[PDB]
Design an enzyme around this catalytic site. Structure first.
Site, mmCIF file in Angstrom:
data_model
loop_
_atom_site.group_PDB
_atom_site.id
_atom_site.type_symbol
_atom_site.label_atom_id
_atom_site.label_comp_id
_atom_site.label_asym_id
_atom_site.label_seq_id
_atom_site.Cartn_x
_atom_site.Cartn_y
_atom_site.Cartn_z
ATOM 1 N N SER A 24 -10.196 7.744 2.695
ATOM 2 C CA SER A 24 -9.278 8.825 2.368
ATOM 3 C C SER A 24 -8.665 8.665 0.959
ATOM 4 N N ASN A 40 -13.489 2.636 7.632
ATOM 5 C CA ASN A 40 -12.287 2.342 6.851
ATOM 6 C C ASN A 40 -11.686 3.652 6.310
ATOM 7 N N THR A 75 0.816 -1.222 0.000
ATOM 8 C CA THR A 75 0.000 0.000 0.000
ATOM 9 C C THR A 75 0.839 1.257 0.000
ATOM 10 N N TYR A 117 -10.145 7.320 -1.531
ATOM 11 C CA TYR A 117 -11.191 7.566 -2.500
ATOM 12 C C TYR A 117 -11.485 9.044 -2.650
ATOM 13 N N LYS A 138 1.899 3.307 -2.390
ATOM 14 C CA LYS A 138 2.875 3.492 -3.467
ATOM 15 C C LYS A 138 2.159 3.686 -4.791
ATOM 16 N N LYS A 139 0.890 4.111 -4.770
ATOM 17 C CA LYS A 139 0.132 4.455 -5.988
ATOM 18 C C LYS A 139 -0.262 3.251 -6.857
ATOM 19 N N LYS A 151 -9.395 11.310 -2.110
ATOM 20 C CA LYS A 151 -8.214 11.902 -2.769
ATOM 21 C C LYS A 151 -8.176 11.592 -4.257
HETATM 22 C C1 LIG Z 1 -15.212 -0.356 -2.731
HETATM 23 C C2 LIG Z 1 -14.282 -1.004 -1.753
HETATM 24 O O1 LIG Z 1 -13.877 -2.113 -2.046
HETATM 25 S S1 LIG Z 1 -13.800 -0.287 -0.276
HETATM 26 C C3 LIG Z 1 -12.257 -1.086 0.076
HETATM 27 C C4 LIG Z 1 -11.028 -0.171 -0.038
HETATM 28 N N1 LIG Z 1 -9.814 -0.947 0.180
HETATM 29 C C5 LIG Z 1 -9.119 -0.926 1.310
HETATM 30 O O2 LIG Z 1 -9.361 -0.150 2.221
HETATM 31 C C6 LIG Z 1 -8.048 -2.004 1.458
HETATM 32 C C7 LIG Z 1 -6.779 -1.539 2.167
HETATM 33 N N2 LIG Z 1 -6.062 -0.531 1.392
HETATM 34 C C8 LIG Z 1 -5.652 -0.717 0.146
HETATM 35 O O3 LIG Z 1 -5.752 -1.798 -0.451
HETATM 36 C C9 LIG Z 1 -5.042 0.493 -0.506
HETATM 37 O O4 LIG Z 1 -4.549 1.351 0.514
HETATM 38 C C10 LIG Z 1 -6.002 1.250 -1.425
HETATM 39 C C11 LIG Z 1 -6.414 0.308 -2.534
HETATM 40 C C12 LIG Z 1 -7.222 1.668 -0.672
HETATM 41 C C13 LIG Z 1 -5.350 2.500 -2.019
HETATM 42 O O5 LIG Z 1 -4.183 2.195 -2.818
HETATM 43 P P1 LIG Z 1 -2.710 2.773 -2.552
HETATM 44 O O6 LIG Z 1 -1.837 2.503 -3.746
HETATM 45 O O7 LIG Z 1 -2.304 2.230 -1.214
HETATM 46 O O8 LIG Z 1 -3.044 4.348 -2.384
HETATM 47 P P2 LIG Z 1 -2.120 5.511 -3.040
HETATM 48 O O9 LIG Z 1 -0.661 5.216 -2.734
HETATM 49 O O10 LIG Z 1 -2.517 5.713 -4.471
HETATM 50 O O11 LIG Z 1 -2.693 6.732 -2.188
HETATM 51 C C14 LIG Z 1 -2.241 7.028 -0.871
HETATM 52 C C15 LIG Z 1 -3.393 7.455 -0.005
HETATM 53 O O12 LIG Z 1 -4.223 6.319 0.282
HETATM 54 C C16 LIG Z 1 -4.316 6.169 1.700
HETATM 55 N N3 LIG Z 1 -3.404 5.109 2.170
HETATM 56 C C17 LIG Z 1 -2.795 4.232 1.378
HETATM 57 N N4 LIG Z 1 -2.076 3.316 2.102
HETATM 58 C C18 LIG Z 1 -2.270 3.595 3.393
HETATM 59 C C19 LIG Z 1 -1.771 3.033 4.667
HETATM 60 N N5 LIG Z 1 -0.974 1.947 4.674
HETATM 61 N N6 LIG Z 1 -2.165 3.597 5.811
HETATM 62 C C20 LIG Z 1 -2.983 4.668 5.798
HETATM 63 N N7 LIG Z 1 -3.432 5.257 4.650
HETATM 64 C C21 LIG Z 1 -3.131 4.777 3.437
HETATM 65 C C22 LIG Z 1 -3.983 7.518 2.274
HETATM 66 O O13 LIG Z 1 -5.186 8.252 2.170
HETATM 67 C C23 LIG Z 1 -2.929 8.032 1.331
HETATM 68 O O14 LIG Z 1 -2.876 9.442 1.411
HETATM 69 P P3 LIG Z 1 -1.604 10.209 2.097
HETATM 70 O O15 LIG Z 1 -0.443 9.989 1.185
HETATM 71 O O16 LIG Z 1 -2.204 11.606 2.181
HETATM 72 O O17 LIG Z 1 -1.508 9.438 3.403
HETATM 73 C C1 LIG Z 2 17.255 6.556 12.251
HETATM 74 C C2 LIG Z 2 16.372 5.542 11.547
HETATM 75 O O1 LIG Z 2 16.074 4.489 12.097
HETATM 76 S S1 LIG Z 2 15.809 5.819 9.976
HETATM 77 C C3 LIG Z 2 14.732 4.454 9.658
HETATM 78 C C4 LIG Z 2 13.276 4.781 9.958
HETATM 79 N N1 LIG Z 2 12.473 3.562 9.905
HETATM 80 C C5 LIG Z 2 11.865 3.161 8.785
HETATM 81 O O2 LIG Z 2 11.901 3.828 7.761
HETATM 82 C C6 LIG Z 2 11.188 1.809 8.851
HETATM 83 C C7 LIG Z 2 9.839 1.731 8.154
HETATM 84 N N2 LIG Z 2 8.847 2.665 8.637
HETATM 85 C C8 LIG Z 2 8.405 2.700 9.872
HETATM 86 O O3 LIG Z 2 8.754 1.921 10.740
HETATM 87 C C9 LIG Z 2 7.437 3.800 10.208
HETATM 88 O O4 LIG Z 2 6.721 4.157 9.019
HETATM 89 C C10 LIG Z 2 8.102 5.029 10.870
HETATM 90 C C11 LIG Z 2 8.704 4.627 12.214
HETATM 91 C C12 LIG Z 2 9.203 5.596 9.995
HETATM 92 C C13 LIG Z 2 7.074 6.109 11.155
HETATM 93 O O5 LIG Z 2 6.093 5.575 12.038
HETATM 94 P P1 LIG Z 2 4.556 5.519 11.641
HETATM 95 O O6 LIG Z 2 3.781 5.242 12.923
HETATM 96 O O7 LIG Z 2 4.410 4.627 10.430
HETATM 97 O O8 LIG Z 2 4.287 7.033 11.116
HETATM 98 P P2 LIG Z 2 3.055 7.952 11.645
HETATM 99 O O9 LIG Z 2 1.755 7.173 11.502
HETATM 100 O O10 LIG Z 2 3.405 8.518 12.996
HETATM 101 O O11 LIG Z 2 3.131 9.120 10.538
HETATM 102 C C14 LIG Z 2 2.754 8.875 9.175
HETATM 103 C C15 LIG Z 2 3.709 9.538 8.206
HETATM 104 O O12 LIG Z 2 4.883 8.726 8.067
HETATM 105 C C16 LIG Z 2 5.090 8.333 6.707
HETATM 106 N N3 LIG Z 2 4.648 6.915 6.511
HETATM 107 C C17 LIG Z 2 4.278 6.099 7.509
HETATM 108 N N4 LIG Z 2 3.900 4.890 7.064
HETATM 109 C C18 LIG Z 2 3.987 4.911 5.746
HETATM 110 C C19 LIG Z 2 3.727 3.930 4.681
HETATM 111 N N5 LIG Z 2 3.268 2.682 4.947
HETATM 112 N N6 LIG Z 2 3.929 4.329 3.441
HETATM 113 C C20 LIG Z 2 4.384 5.568 3.133
HETATM 114 N N7 LIG Z 2 4.630 6.501 4.071
HETATM 115 C C21 LIG Z 2 4.472 6.240 5.381
HETATM 116 C C22 LIG Z 2 4.290 9.366 5.911
HETATM 117 O O13 LIG Z 2 5.071 10.564 5.656
HETATM 118 C C23 LIG Z 2 3.139 9.711 6.810
HETATM 119 O O14 LIG Z 2 2.604 11.015 6.512
HETATM 120 P P3 LIG Z 2 1.318 11.071 5.506
HETATM 121 O O15 LIG Z 2 0.209 10.673 6.394
HETATM 122 O O16 LIG Z 2 1.377 12.528 5.080
HETATM 123 O O17 LIG Z 2 1.649 10.064 4.411
#
Ligand SMILES: CC(=O)SCCNC(=O)CCNC(=O)[C@H](O)C(C)(C)COP(=O)(O)OP(=O)(O)OC[C@H]1O[C@@H](n2cnc3c(N)ncnc32)[C@H](O)[C@@H]1OP(=O)(O)O
Ligand SMILES: CC(=O)SCCNC(=O)CCNC(=O)[C@H](O)C(C)(C)COP(=O)(O)OP(=O)(O)OC[C@H]1O[C@@H](n2cnc3c(N)ncnc32)[C@H](O)[C@@H]1OP(=O)(O)O
Ligand SMILES: [Br-]
Ligand SMILES: [Cl-]
Ligand SMILES: [Cl-]
Ligand SMILES: [Cl-]
Ligand code: NI
Lengths: 159, 159
Positions: free
Chosen positions: B136, B131, B99, B138, B101-102, B140
């Site tokens: 979010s 959910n 998730t 959707y 990564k678009k 977006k």
């Molecule tokens: C009609 C239905 O079936 S409803 C079911 C919808 N599906 C789900 O909720 C399943 C779980 N999630 C997923 O499979 C995916 O996150 C999807 C399909 C919803 C979206 O695809 P992605 O490639 O992950 O989303 P993409 O990277 O394009 O967009 C990122 C945004 O999606 C949301 N998002 C994606 N991954 C996460 C994550 N791991 N945690 C929280 N928010 C997420 C956030 O809104 C994010 O916005 P931000 O960058 O401002 O945080």
């Molecule tokens: C000194 C060091 O150790 S550097 C190494 C840091 N560790 C890592 O990179 C390991 C992998 N990632 C993680 O463990 C976690 O994502 C952490 C520790 C970096 C951050 O903790 P989280 O609880 O996930 O982050 P939190 O929920 O507080 O904040 C979310 C933000 O973090 C980033 N982020 C968190 N999870 C994701 C994800 N699955 N995909 C993309 N971006 C993410 C985004 O910038 C997000 O902001 P957005 O909502 O605008 O996208």
């Protein structure tokens, strides 16, 4: 889902290796080769080496080594060292499926609460420049880039 | 990481079930019990039901069923149904670790490209209101809430 933060202990050892392992393979997938990642886990996260670090962290108030437990299961951890009254954030890793729910922020906030009571006014860290996940998490928690060192960015936050 | 999108085939069935299992267990963890979520996989995603839907998709009838493949292995899918002049987005799920990564946006946009060719001017969907992850994403991507139904928001997008 209920999150508790507390000092790691030796019973956390085996689950700590698995969290690290899973987090490194996921976080550095586009960045380091598979072999680099496996060598890193095998060497830095051996049973013996981690045990020693966990025991050190127990008696040493200037080493913070905390775990995040989601309903009693270890799913992340943080490591910081304080030297000359400055902090270094060495390590912060969650299981990939537990990211993006503020558990990392919670680990950081617990550390900073401890830094605050000690009077630490600065924290630095190294993050790899292609680790967009980590790098963006830190800039969203008040860290600023001050320098580069090899493939890392050096970030700082002032208190 | 090389992502490829294409229609599902019967060959994909077994791996599609596992993606569904893992995505659903993660997506709805704070919302439904573990047991209820599993019961879905036995029922709506039975081998036979899914095969029929994959074939209708392949036959270009009312179903559109596309998979996202990371270096040749299935890691997500989108399932839509067309009725009259409108599309309903039935399902869109990725493995948790893939998730944010678009890859989801890629699936949607590939689906929309196929929808624009078929003349469809409107898409609706039902997303569970707790959910945040899905909701979010959707909002977006142009979807707006038009209504509620049971536990879901009804969202709509116009072309
Ligand atoms: C009609 C239905 O079936 S409803 C079911 C919808 N599906 C789900 O909720 C399943 C779980 N999630 C997923 O499979 C995916 O996150 C999807 C399909 C919803 C979206 O695809 P992605 O490639 O992950 O989303 P993409 O990277 O394009 O967009 C990122 C945004 O999606 C949301 N998002 C994606 N991954 C996460 C994550 N791991 N945690 C929280 N928010 C997420 C956030 O809104 C994010 O916005 P931000 O960058 O401002 O945080
Ligand atoms: C000194 C060091 O150790 S550097 C190494 C840091 N560790 C890592 O990179 C390991 C992998 N990632 C993680 O463990 C976690 O994502 C952490 C520790 C970096 C951050 O903790 P989280 O609880 O996930 O982050 P939190 O929920 O507080 O904040 C979310 C933000 O973090 C980033 N982020 C968190 N999870 C994701 C994800 N699955 N995909 C993309 N971006 C993410 C985004 O910038 C997000 O902001 P957005 O909502 O605008 O996208
Ligand atoms: Br390497
Ligand atoms: Cl490390
Ligand atoms: Cl660069
Ligand atoms: Cl509500
Ligand atoms: Ni995000």
């Amino acid at each position: 889902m209920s999150i508790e933060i507390r000092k790691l202990s030796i019973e956390d050892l085996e689950t700590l290796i698995e969290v690290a392992r899973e987090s490194w393979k996921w976080t550095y997938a586009g960045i380091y080769s598979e072999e680099y990642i496996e060598s890193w886990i095998r060497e830095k996260y051996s049973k013996e080496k981690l045990l020693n670090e966990i025991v050190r962290s127990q008696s040493n108030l200037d080493i913070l080594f905390l775990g995040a437990f989601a309903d009693s299961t270890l799913i992340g951890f943080i490591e910081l060292k304080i030297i000359a009254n400055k902090a270094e954030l060495l390590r912060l890793y969650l299981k990939p499926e537990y990211t993006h729910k503020k558990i990392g922020k919670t680990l950081l906030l617990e550390a900073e609460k401890i830094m605050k009571k000690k009077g630490i006014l600065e924290c630095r860290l190294y993050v790899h420049r292609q680790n967009s996940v980590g790098f963006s998490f830190y800039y969203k928690n008040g860290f600023k880039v001050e320098d580069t060192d090899g493939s890392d960015f050096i970030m700082e936050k002032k208190y």
